[model samples]
Target: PWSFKDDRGTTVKLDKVPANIVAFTGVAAALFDYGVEVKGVFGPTTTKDGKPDVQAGDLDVDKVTVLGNEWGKLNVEKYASLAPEVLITTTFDTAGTLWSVPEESKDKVAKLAPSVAISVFDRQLTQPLQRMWELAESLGADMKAKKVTDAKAAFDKAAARLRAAAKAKPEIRVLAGSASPDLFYVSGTNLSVDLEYFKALGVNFVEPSEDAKKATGGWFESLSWENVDKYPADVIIMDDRASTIQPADITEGTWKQLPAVKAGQVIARSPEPILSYDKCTPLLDNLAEAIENAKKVG
Candidate 1:
């Protein structure tokens, strides 16, 4: 039995240490990071191929239940039959912010099992990891919590190494990509949380509007590519949709003429994890690697 407060300020208590757990977010990967066995997964082949890497395979797939897309619709009856003690979910614009869970569905699910909603986007390597530790602890996985801590420490070390190198190199400028052809939603000043990741690495971010102090209702917004002409920076990081029909579309044409792009200073990131909280911890190494490899336009 264990208890802890989630990031949303709800106290979660398990009557006994859970031997069976079902993760709603991309926790299968994290469970591997934490060294725990997931009893079942509520979603489908977390990967497109549905083939589990060694880590995901460690859990018994036959025993796992797949709950379809969270937002589109859920299989309420089937989900209840699965008998998962906990249902973990990751939210961005919906559960994390804007909308509330419908009462009927929420009531039925709560009666059947305890549910926890966490924001994977807010879960950066620093504070978000702490929340993950707390969530793991609440789920009766102390070892898993420790694993997250250890992983974070490793990330800190790697970040520190990058910082040391950055101290000797020029600072970096970052920008979040937009879905529209005319815009680019750049990271703003309030993105201070990420500064923690770059601070130790001695990298600097381009300044956003002073008004960025408030949450923009979402992680990114449409910024006209015309703004790219005003950008004064040595590097540009572009994030885009990976599986879209037109995946190769350039949302920001302004970068082509920018000194940084002329010198091949643009980097593209999969908009998936970069915009997700649950995936952030697991993707830190990728982000760090990108920063470490960012080149300066000659």
Candidate 2:
């Protein structure tokens, strides 16, 4: 028998470690590291060229059933046919609701299987990543396995380097944002796990003003192209999701005028929901290098 409590404080008891599992695309990728194979996955649609999302990590979508390609547009019929014993997804809110599941279809999805919502947002990366490790352990993963331990060690080493680099260059400010042709969305340090992690690591992430926080509900500050210079940063980390404004889309805008942009201090990253230590090591290493190499532009 197997049982565990999800982030929402609900206890889920299963007769055994669930073998027939369906997960969110990012969650599935993290589970793959722990040797847990999911039967299906659902998330935002991939590119037209048929390449898997970089956020999906090493998950081969062709090997498992894809319940849906777009968020809030899950194929319930296909999901039901799979008869999943457990459903795994991530959450950002304290309400315990799944992140991408549409309100109208929540009941239907809930009826399909016992759902586990691992909280990912509004917290440090370590909390959710540790939660995932615990969950994987409950599902028969060997916590002491060399692969898992090595990844954790690598993450620790990277985090140490990041901290040291941040200390060495405390004035190098970083901005986490997404840019559209007309608007730029600046992320709140407290609103994202990765940004929060950076803040904890002593990375100088830029914070929006009080007015911007109130206007954006402390999530993101939306600014017009002309007003994009409101927040100055030494480095800009842009969202690399398919739906967000890509670098190509910013060519027509005044984004190039920004000091960070002109300095080539832009780093592209996906909003990582899956908090595997191994997956996060490279991100920290990149930030460390960026901070070490950055000039005082902001």
TM-score of structure candidate 1: 0.68
Distance from true position, residue 254, model 2, in Å?
1.3
lDDT of 2 by residue, 138-235 (tens): 99988889999999999999999999999999999898888766678888788678888889999988888757877856778888878888888999
TM-score of 2: 0.95
Specify the highest-TM-score model's number. Answer: 2
* Pairs of residues at least 3 apart in sequence or in different chains that clash in candidate 2: 45-69
**lDDT for predicted candidate 1 compared with the true structure:** 0.51
Deviation in Å, model 2, residue 195 alpha carbon: 1.0
Error of 1 at 264 (Å): 4.2
Per-residue lDDT for 252 in model 1?
Answer: 48
Task: Score candidate 2 by lDDT.
Answer: 0.83
